[PDB]
Amino acid sequence: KKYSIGLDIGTNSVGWAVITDEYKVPSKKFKVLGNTDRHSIKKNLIGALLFDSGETAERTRLKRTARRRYTRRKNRICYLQEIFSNEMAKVDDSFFHRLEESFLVEEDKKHERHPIFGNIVDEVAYHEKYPTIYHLRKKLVDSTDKADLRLIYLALAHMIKFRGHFLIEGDLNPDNSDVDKLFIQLVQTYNQLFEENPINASGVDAKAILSARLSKSRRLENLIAQLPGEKKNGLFGNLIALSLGLTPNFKSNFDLAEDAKLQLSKDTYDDDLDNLLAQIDLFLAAKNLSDAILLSDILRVNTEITKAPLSASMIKRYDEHHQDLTLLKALVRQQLPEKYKEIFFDQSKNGYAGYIDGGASQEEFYKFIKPILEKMDGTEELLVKLNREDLLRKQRTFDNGSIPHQIHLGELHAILRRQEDFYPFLKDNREKIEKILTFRIPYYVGPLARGNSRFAWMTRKSEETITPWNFEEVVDKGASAQSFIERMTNFDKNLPNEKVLPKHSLLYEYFTVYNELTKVKYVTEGMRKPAFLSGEQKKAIVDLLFKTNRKVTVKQLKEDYFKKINASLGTYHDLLKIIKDKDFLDNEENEDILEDIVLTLTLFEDREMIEERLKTYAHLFDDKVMKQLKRRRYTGWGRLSRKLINGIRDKQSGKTILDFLKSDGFANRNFMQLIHDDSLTFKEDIQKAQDSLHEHIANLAGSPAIKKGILQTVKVVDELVKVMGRHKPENIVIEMAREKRQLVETRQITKHVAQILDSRMNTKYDENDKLIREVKVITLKSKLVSDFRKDFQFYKVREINNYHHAHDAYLNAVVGTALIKKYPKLESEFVYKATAKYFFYSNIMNFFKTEITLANGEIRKRPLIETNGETGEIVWDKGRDFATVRKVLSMPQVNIVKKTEVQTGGFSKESIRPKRNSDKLIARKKDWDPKKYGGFLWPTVAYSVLVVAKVEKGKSKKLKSVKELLGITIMERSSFEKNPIDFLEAKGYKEVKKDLIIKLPKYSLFELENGRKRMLASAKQLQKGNELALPSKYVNFLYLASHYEKLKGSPEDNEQKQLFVEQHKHYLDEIIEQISEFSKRVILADANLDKVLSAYNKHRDKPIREQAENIIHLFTLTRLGAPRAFKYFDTTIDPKQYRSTKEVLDATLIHQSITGLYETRIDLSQLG
RNA sequence: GCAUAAAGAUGAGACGCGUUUUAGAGCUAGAAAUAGCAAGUUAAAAUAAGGCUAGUCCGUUAUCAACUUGAAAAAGUGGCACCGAGUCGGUGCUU
DNA sequence: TTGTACTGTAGCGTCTCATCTTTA
DNA sequence: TACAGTACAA
C-alpha cells in the first residue's frame, strides 16, 4: 500500500518514478478528458519531464544597459540642441529638423534633401572642403575665423555623441605632452633639485619603452645609457616608477623629501604626494611622462604643433589612405589588369570594394590582399604598412576604444575658446557644454527613476528634472551611495532584521580571534588534566600579542605568564599606526563611533563622501589625521549583526556572547556551541527571530536557472501525491551530484530539494515534538547508482532515448530504500577523514553482490536474502529483485513529457536586412515602411493559434471556409491577447469562431496514424515526438561494444565481455531492423533511411567497435526533438525537415499534465 | 566560524565597432542590353515595435497542460486488484 | 499558381565598481 | 534550429 518516489533532477530534465516496497512500478487506468472516444488509458508510474534550460538574466541586463546608454546619449544631443536653438533660429532655422529627417527617403522628407546646408552646391562644396568630420574639427580648433554656426554644431555634437572612455581620471592635457622626448626636461628638474649638473647627452625616451612590455629589464640599462650613472634606481632619468608606480607598494627610491610607498595609481597622486603638496618638482615631469607613454601609444607622431592632435592623426590616416589607394590602383592596373575588377568593383570578395562597400573587416581585407600585394613587385612599403596593420585604414575602426574623453574635451574646449568672441552665447554657457560632455551618472547612484523602477535606489533632495548641471543639488549622493551598498550586503542568517557589520569591525575581529582562541587548550606540566584558556589568559594573549602584532602563538603562557603571574586583529594595528593612541582603541566608551568610522570607510570609496561622513567628528580630531583616515579604506562585510554581538545577555551566566568569548573561565564554550544550546537562552530567541514557495525559491540564492529544476521537481511531487490518492510517500530519494555551469547549477538544483520537499511534505506535529517525521527525504550521491548500473549489467546509453532519466530515477529509488532498510541506524547520515569516508562509501555497496571480493583476489559469499538483522525483515532478495529491475528497465511505455512553453525573448533576429520588395520584413519603426527602409527577419513565435474562419481567396472574392494554424509572434502577442477577433480580422480572416481558438505553445503534442507523434515547433515547423524503446539486450550489447577496450575492467572479466560482444554480432542486424521499422513507422524519412541502409551494408566488414560507434551515432535519426545532421562511417546524412503543419490540423491534440498521467485528447478533425 | 581554492550569480555606470536609410551632383561612347574610366575613408538618424505612472523611467530573466469556479491571487476536478507488454493491452470487483 | 526540397542565415569586442553564493 | 531564400514541381 505504501510507496516511495524516486527523483533525478537535472538542468534539462526531471526524472520521476514511483515504486512500491518490493521495487515494482505500479500502473493505473487514468481518465481521459476531451471529445475523443477513448475514455481510459493504462499508464505506468515512471517517467521524465523535459524542458528547455533556464537562462540567466545576464543578456537582459546587457541589453537594458544598452537601452539606457542610447536614451542618455540622445538626451545629451537634445541638451546641446536646446542650447543652440535660439541662435540657430536666426540662421537656417530648419537645420535641426533636417538632421532629424536625415534617415527618411527623398519623398518622405518635408525639407530639402541635403541636411547640413540645404542645397546641392554648398553641400558638395562642404564635402570637398572637409572630406571627413575630423578635417572640420581640426579647422575649428586651429583656425581663427568666424565659422558658420552649423559647422560648430556638427563638430560639438560629434564630440559629445562619441566621447571616449573615462578610465583615466586625472585632468590630463595632451598639448603639454605632445612630444615624444622629455628626457632633458626631467633631467633639468632633477639636477635643480639634486645639485650635480653632470655632463649629459639627449635622447628620445617615450617610445623606447613602448617597444616592449614596460619593465625594468629594458629601463635600467636604457636609463643608464641615457644619463651617465651615479645611481641605478633613483637617477630620475626616465625610471619606470616615475612613469607608472609599482603594482606592489614599495618605498621611495632616492626619495625627494619623505619616505612613502609608491604604487600604480590614477586616483591618489594628487593626494599621497603630501611630502611636497602639503608642504611646498620631479613628479610634474613624471606625470608628463606618464601621459606621454600612452598618448604616444594612441596618437601618431605630430611634427606640427596643433591643439587638436586626434583630428590631425585622423587626417594623417585619411591622407595615407588616399595615397596608398592611388598607388595600389596604378599597380594593379599595370601588373594584374584582370584582378582590378574583382578587387575594386566586386563588393562581395573581401577586396577593396568589399572592404569599403561590402562587409569585410580590416583583417579580412588584409588577408585577401596580402597574396595579391606580395605576388607583385614595387609593393614593399605597402607590405610593411600591412604588417604594421596601417594600410588603407579608416577613421572609425574597432580600436578607437583607447581614446580618453580628455582629448575630445580638449578639442571641444579649444573650439569654444576660439569661437566664443563671435557668438556671445557660446561664451555664456561654455561650462554647460563641457559639463554635457564630461558628465557621468555615478555607478553608486544608478537609474534616475521617480519610483517606477525596480532597479533604482536613488533618493533625491528635490523633485526637479535632473540635468547634468543640477545633479549635485538634486540627488542626495550620500544616501544613494549608502543604499548602493545596503541593498547588496545581506542580513545575518540568524536574526534577519539587522544589517551585518563590516568584516574589519573591531567587534567582529574580536569575535573571530576570541572564538578560535576559546577552544585553545594547553597541556603542560602545571596540570595533570587539559584546561582551556581562561579569560585572564585570553586577555593576556590578546593584549600582549594581538594588540601589537597580527600573527599569533600561544606559547607565551608557558614561557612567560605561568612564571610571571587564521586569526587577526588587523584593524586595531592599522588604527594604532594611524591614531597611534592605544587608549582610544582600548576605550570601549566610544567603540560605537569607532565602528562608525570603520563603517563609513567600508561603505564609501569616493573620497569626498568619506569626508562628508567625517564632518560630524571634526571636533574629535585635528586636520592632518583625517587626511590620514581618508587614505584608509576597508573592504568586506561580517557574517553576523551587532545585536547578536552585544545586544543580548544570557539569563543564566549573565554574560553577553562576546563576554563568553572574552571570558568563559575553564570549560570554554565557542560561539556555535553557545547559540546551539537552549539551557543558555540563545536558541529559543533565534527560533523566535524567524511565506511562499516562489520566494523561498529565490532568497535561497542563485541564478534563475535553479527555479526550473527545483520548481518542476516540486510540482511533479505534488501531482504524484495527487495521483496516489493523496497518500504521502514514506521516502523521497534525491540525486545530489556530489563527490561546468551544468554541474554547479545542478548541485544548486539539488541542494534546495531536501529542504523544500521536507518542509512541504512534513507539516503536521504535536505538543511533544514539533515535527512528526513521516516522509524521509533521502539524499544519494551519483556514484552509488553509477556503480549499481556498472556492476549488474544495467548500462545506460544516453544516445538511444530519453528513458534513461526515468530509469535513473527508478534506480535512485530502489538503491535508496534498499540501502536504508539494510542499515536503519544510519538514517541520520542520509535522511534529511575524506579517505575514510571514501572507503566507507566504497565498501557499503557490496551487500548487493552475491560474491564479494576484497583487495586480496579471494572470495567470500553472502546469502541471497538480505535482512535488516535488527529485525528479520527481508530488505533485498538476489534473484527476484534483479528480475524486477530488469523487467522495469525493459518496459516500453514511459511517460516522457516535453514541457510546453510560450516562447519569450527577442522580437526577432538582431541584424537589419537591406530593403526589398518583400512582405516578410519587419518594420523598424511605425512610419518606416520596410520596402523603403529595410528591417528585421526571423521573428520568434510566442505561441501558435488554431483558427477556423472564412478567408477571401480567389480573384472572384467569395468565402471559402478554412482551418489553419497561425503564428502569433512576440510583437503581436499583446495586441492579440488584447482582442483576438479584431487582430484575426485584420489578418484577413472573416467570421472567426471565437470559442474554437486553441492556444498552442511550442512543443504542443499531436498524435497521428500508427501512434506517430509530432511536437509543434512553430506554426510552420514540427518535431519528432516518439521514443524508440529499444530492448535492454541491445542497449547492453551497444554499451559493451562501443566502449570496447576503454572499459578498463579486471582482465578475465573484460576478456569474457570481449568474447560476449564478439559472439553476439547479429545484434547489429537486429538493431538495424529495429531502427528501420521504427523509422518507417514514425520518422517517415525514406531517402535518409535507405542511405543509412546502404552505408551500413557497405561497411559490414568493419570491426565491431567502429560499427557499434556509428550505430550509436545512428540514433540521431530516431531521436525525439529537432531533426539533426549525423554521420555514419563516411557519409554525413542531412536531416529530413518536417516543414509543414498541414498534417496536424486533423490529428489528436494531446494535453499532457506535468507528469503526463492526466491527459485531455482533442480530436481536431471534428472542428469547423 | 576562519584561512586556502575554484567556479558561478545579481545589479549599476561607461566606451568602441557593426547594421540600416539618406546626404557626399559620377563622366564618356551610345535605342541599349551596356562597355570603358573616375570615385570610395565621412556624417545624420534608429538600434528591440513601443508603453504611460511622462522618469535623463520601463520594455528579451523567472512564471505558464486542459477544464470548473475566481477581476486576479488562488482554490477545485480524474476508483481498485490481477495476468500480461512495441509506447500500454486484456480480465475481474466497485458506483 | 503554389506546395516540397535544398542550401543558407543567424551583433559583438572590452572596461570600471559593487556585493554575494556552493562546493573542495 | 527555425526560418529564409532560390528554384523546382503542381
Coordinates of N, CA and C (backbone and C1' of nucleotides) in Angstrom, one line a residue, chain A residues 70 266 443 484-485 488-490 633 637 639 738-739 747 751 909-911 913 938 1134 1136 1139-1140, chain C:
Chain A
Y70 N 21.7 54.4 -24.9 CA 21.2 55.1 -26.1 C 20.2 56.3 -25.7
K266 N 45.9 56.0 -10.5 CA 45.4 57.3 -11.2 C 44.4 58.0 -10.3
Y443 N 28.2 55.3 -10.7 CA 27.7 53.9 -10.6 C 26.9 53.6 -9.3
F484 N 23.4 52.1 -2.1 CA 24.1 51.2 -3.1 C 24.7 50.0 -2.4
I485 N 25.3 50.2 -1.2 CA 25.9 49.1 -0.5 C 24.8 48.3 0.4
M488 N 22.8 45.5 -1.0 CA 23.6 44.3 -1.5 C 24.0 43.4 -0.4
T489 N 24.6 43.9 0.7 CA 25.0 43.1 1.8 C 23.8 42.6 2.6
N490 N 23.7 41.2 2.6 CA 22.6 40.6 3.2 C 22.6 40.6 4.7
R633 N 40.9 52.6 4.0 CA 39.8 52.1 3.2 C 39.6 50.6 3.5
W637 N 32.5 42.4 4.4 CA 31.5 42.5 5.4 C 31.4 41.3 6.3
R639 N 29.7 38.4 8.9 CA 28.7 37.4 8.7 C 27.5 37.5 9.7
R738 N 27.0 15.2 -5.7 CA 28.3 15.5 -5.0 C 29.2 14.3 -5.0
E739 N 30.5 14.5 -4.9 CA 31.5 13.5 -4.9 C 31.7 12.9 -3.5
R747 N 24.0 21.0 -8.9 CA 24.2 20.9 -7.4 C 23.4 21.9 -6.7
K751 N 20.6 20.9 -3.9 CA 20.8 21.3 -2.5 C 19.5 21.7 -1.9
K909 N 15.5 38.2 -35.0 CA 17.0 38.3 -35.1 C 17.4 39.8 -35.2
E910 N 18.6 40.1 -34.7 CA 19.0 41.4 -34.5 C 19.6 42.2 -35.7
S911 N 20.1 41.5 -36.7 CA 20.6 42.2 -37.8 C 19.5 42.8 -38.6
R913 N 18.3 43.8 -42.1 CA 18.4 43.4 -43.5 C 18.1 44.6 -44.4
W938 N 13.4 36.7 -39.4 CA 13.3 35.7 -38.4 C 12.6 36.1 -37.1
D1134 N 22.2 14.5 -44.1 CA 21.4 15.7 -43.8 C 20.0 15.4 -43.4
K1136 N 15.9 15.2 -42.7 CA 14.6 15.4 -43.3 C 13.8 16.4 -42.4
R1139 N 8.6 20.4 -42.4 CA 8.5 21.8 -42.6 C 7.1 22.2 -43.0
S1140 N 6.1 21.4 -42.7 CA 4.7 21.7 -43.0 C 3.8 21.2 -41.8
Chain C
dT1 O5' -0.7 32.1 -61.2 C5' -2.0 31.6 -60.8 C4' -1.9 30.5 -59.8 C3' -1.2 31.0 -58.4 O3' -2.0 30.4 -57.3 C1' 0.0 29.2 -59.3
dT2 P -1.7 30.9 -55.8 O5' -0.9 29.7 -55.2 C5' -1.6 28.5 -54.8 C4' -0.6 27.3 -54.6 C3' 0.2 27.4 -53.3 O3' 0.3 26.0 -52.7 C1' 1.7 27.2 -55.0
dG3 P -0.7 25.6 -51.5 O5' -0.5 24.0 -51.3 C5' 0.4 23.4 -50.4 C4' 1.5 22.7 -51.2 C3' 2.7 22.1 -50.5 O3' 2.4 20.8 -50.2 C1' 3.3 23.3 -52.5
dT4 P 3.4 19.8 -49.3 O5' 4.6 19.5 -50.3 C5' 5.8 18.8 -49.9 C4' 6.9 18.7 -50.9 C3' 8.3 18.5 -50.3 O3' 9.2 17.7 -51.2 C1' 8.3 20.5 -51.5
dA5 P 10.2 16.7 -50.5 O5' 11.4 16.5 -51.6 C5' 12.0 17.2 -52.6 C4' 13.1 18.2 -52.2 C3' 13.6 18.1 -50.7 O3' 14.6 17.0 -50.5 C1' 13.3 20.3 -51.3
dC6 P 16.0 16.9 -51.3 O5' 16.5 18.4 -51.8 C5' 17.9 18.7 -52.1 C4' 18.4 20.1 -51.7 C3' 19.4 20.3 -50.5 O3' 20.6 20.1 -51.2 C1' 17.7 22.1 -50.5
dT7 P 22.1 20.2 -50.6 O5' 22.3 21.7 -50.2 C5' 23.0 22.6 -51.0 C4' 22.8 24.1 -50.7 C3' 23.7 24.7 -49.6 O3' 24.2 25.9 -50.1 C1' 21.5 25.1 -49.1
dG8 P 25.4 26.6 -49.3 O5' 24.7 27.8 -48.4 C5' 24.2 29.0 -49.0 C4' 23.3 29.7 -48.0 C3' 24.0 30.2 -46.7 O3' 24.6 31.4 -47.1 C1' 21.9 29.1 -46.4
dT9 P 25.1 32.5 -46.0 O5' 24.0 32.9 -45.0 C5' 23.4 34.2 -44.9 C4' 22.4 34.1 -43.8 C3' 22.9 34.6 -42.4 O3' 22.4 35.8 -42.0 C1' 21.4 32.7 -42.3
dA10 P 23.3 36.9 -41.3 O5' 23.0 36.6 -39.7 C5' 21.8 36.9 -39.0 C4' 21.5 35.8 -38.0 C3' 22.4 35.8 -36.7 O3' 21.7 36.6 -35.7 C1' 22.0 33.6 -37.6
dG11 P 22.2 38.1 -35.3 O5' 23.8 38.0 -35.0 C5' 24.3 39.3 -35.2 C4' 25.3 39.7 -34.3 C3' 25.0 39.4 -32.8 O3' 25.4 38.1 -32.4 C1' 25.5 41.7 -33.1
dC12 P 26.9 37.6 -31.9 O5' 27.9 38.6 -32.6 C5' 29.3 38.4 -32.3 C4' 30.1 39.5 -31.5 C3' 30.3 39.4 -30.0 O3' 31.5 38.5 -29.9 C1' 29.8 41.6 -30.7
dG13 P 32.3 38.3 -28.6 O5' 33.3 39.6 -28.5 C5' 34.5 39.7 -29.2 C4' 35.3 41.0 -28.9 C3' 35.5 41.3 -27.4 O3' 36.5 40.5 -26.9 C1' 34.9 43.3 -28.5
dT14 P 36.4 39.9 -25.4 O5' 35.6 41.1 -24.6 C5' 36.0 41.5 -23.3 C4' 36.7 42.8 -23.3 C3' 36.7 43.6 -22.0 O3' 37.7 43.1 -21.1 C1' 36.0 45.0 -23.8
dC15 P 39.0 44.0 -20.8 O5' 38.5 45.2 -19.9 C5' 39.2 46.4 -20.1 C4' 38.4 47.6 -19.5 C3' 38.1 47.5 -18.0 O3' 39.2 47.7 -17.2 C1' 36.2 48.4 -19.3
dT16 P 39.3 47.1 -15.7 O5' 38.5 48.2 -14.8 C5' 38.8 49.6 -14.9 C4' 37.7 50.4 -14.4 C3' 37.3 50.2 -13.0 O3' 38.1 50.9 -12.1 C1' 35.4 50.4 -14.4
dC17 P 38.4 50.4 -10.7 O5' 37.0 50.4 -10.0 C5' 36.5 49.3 -9.3 C4' 35.1 49.6 -8.9 C3' 34.6 48.5 -7.9 O3' 35.1 48.9 -6.7 C1' 32.9 49.1 -9.5
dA18 P 35.0 48.0 -5.4 O5' 33.6 48.2 -4.9 C5' 32.9 47.1 -4.3 C4' 31.4 47.3 -4.5 C3' 30.6 46.1 -3.9 O3' 30.3 46.3 -2.5 C1' 29.8 46.6 -6.1
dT19 P 31.4 45.7 -1.4 O5' 30.6 45.0 -0.4 C5' 30.4 43.6 -0.5 C4' 29.1 43.3 -1.1 C3' 28.7 41.8 -1.0 O3' 28.1 41.5 0.3 C1' 28.3 42.6 -3.2
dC20 P 28.8 40.6 1.3 O5' 29.3 39.3 0.5 C5' 28.6 38.1 0.5 C4' 27.4 38.0 -0.4 C3' 26.9 36.6 -0.7 O3' 26.1 36.1 0.2 C1' 27.2 37.9 -2.7
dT21 P 26.5 34.9 1.2 O5' 26.3 33.6 0.3 C5' 25.1 33.4 -0.4 C4' 25.4 32.5 -1.6 C3' 26.1 31.2 -1.3 O3' 25.1 30.2 -1.1 C1' 27.0 32.3 -3.3
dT22 P 25.4 28.9 -0.2 O5' 26.0 27.9 -1.2 C5' 25.2 27.4 -2.3 C4' 25.9 26.3 -3.0 C3' 26.5 25.1 -2.1 O3' 26.3 23.9 -2.7 C1' 28.3 26.2 -3.3
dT23 P 26.4 22.5 -1.9 O5' 27.9 22.0 -2.3 C5' 28.1 21.8 -3.7 C4' 29.6 21.8 -4.0 C3' 30.5 20.9 -3.2 O3' 30.9 19.8 -4.0 C1' 31.5 23.1 -3.5
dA24 P 31.6 18.5 -3.3 O5' 33.1 18.9 -3.2 C5' 33.8 18.9 -1.9 C4' 35.3 19.3 -2.1 C3' 36.1 19.3 -0.9 O3' 36.6 18.1 -0.5 C1' 36.5 21.3 -2.2

